[PDB]
Amino acid sequence: QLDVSCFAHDKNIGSRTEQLSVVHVASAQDCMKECQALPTCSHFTYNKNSKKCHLKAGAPEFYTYTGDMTGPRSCEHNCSDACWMDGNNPLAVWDYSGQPPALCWAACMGTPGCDLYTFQGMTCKLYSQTS
Amino acid sequence: QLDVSCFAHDKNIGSRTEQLSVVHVASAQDCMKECQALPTCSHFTYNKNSKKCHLKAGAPEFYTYTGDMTGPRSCEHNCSDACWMDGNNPLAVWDYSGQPPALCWAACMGTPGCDLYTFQGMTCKLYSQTS
Numbered sequence A, B: 001q002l003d004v005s006c007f008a009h010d011k012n013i014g015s016r017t018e019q020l021s022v023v024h025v026a027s028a029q030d031c032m033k034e035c036q037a038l039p040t041c042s043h044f045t046y047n048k049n050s051k052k053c054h055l056k057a058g059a060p061e062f063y064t065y066t067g068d069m070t071g072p073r074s075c076e077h078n079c080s081d082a083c084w085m086d087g088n089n090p091l092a093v094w095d096y097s098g099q100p101p102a103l104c105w106a107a108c109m110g111t112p113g114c115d116l117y118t119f120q121g122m123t124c125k126l127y128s129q130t131s
């Protein structure tokens, strides 16, 4: 089935975001499938007890409610460092271990076309904005 | 009265980047001050033995040379997440403890104008491109 392992099932995590719709289904995987059938579903809350799947467009608004679990449209969106929705290849990728952020800022200043940088871990990466 | 604490003074870090100017100065702080008086200086290398201060426009090109230290135009550029040269506050910063990065993806999808996100330390940050 669809992968539902990236979010907790047993921590009563709900989202209050306004619903696109609500449907009874027997599993988190079915809830995700219903999310994926709607072009604007970002996430869903599935309740184990009520068997209600609540599909949502907006950003999550987490809260506690018994038997809730909140998943993403797909667990495959696993980027965490610099994540462009439409994709974006870096101008440059350099090792700046032992360097302050301000030197990665300098690398960007000094690179024609650089609009922004990210500096997670040891990696100074330079980006141009999406065309 | 200029902050030179953000880079190392005693690790023999030079930069081979082509210079914009060379002067002799008494301290790393005076070298930074020289860099800040030149609109295109991105960084500098100061040598504690020769007292030579080399101001540089291009991206750093790090290498090892005894007595060298390489600082940024200013230590104030301390953004390390996703950092725009023109400034650009996040659309949102949230504590996403206990959440997968996919739910930050979801947040970006559901947030008008969000073009990219980062997810460091379980902190979801949304950004719009500047325009």
Ligand SMILES: OC[C@H]1O[C@@H](S)[C@H](O)[C@@H](O)[C@H]1O
Pocket: A014, A015, A016, A017, A045, A046, A047, A052, A054, A065, A068
């Ligand atoms: O299952 C609880 C359920 O309750 C509704 S009315 C909420 O807005 C949902 O997101 C979900 O938490």
Ligand SMILES: OC[C@H]1O[C@@H](S)[C@H](O)[C@@H](O)[C@H]1O
Pocket: B014, B015, B016, B017, B045, B046, B047, B050, B052, B054, B065, B068
């Ligand atoms: O202080 C030694 C000096 O060497 C020159 S030739 C480099 O280009 C400078 O940046 C600096 O590393």
Ligand SMILES: [Cl-]
Pocket: A007, A008, A009, A010, A011
């Ligand atoms: Cl769990």
Ligand SMILES: [Cl-]
Pocket: A022, A023, A024
């Ligand atoms: Cl139903």
Ligand SMILES: [Cl-]
Pocket: A111, A112, A113, A114
């Ligand atoms: Cl430029």
Ligand SMILES: [Cl-]
Pocket: A119, A120, A121
């Ligand atoms: Cl880090």
Ligand SMILES: [Cl-]
Pocket: B111, B112, B113, B114
């Ligand atoms: Cl949009």
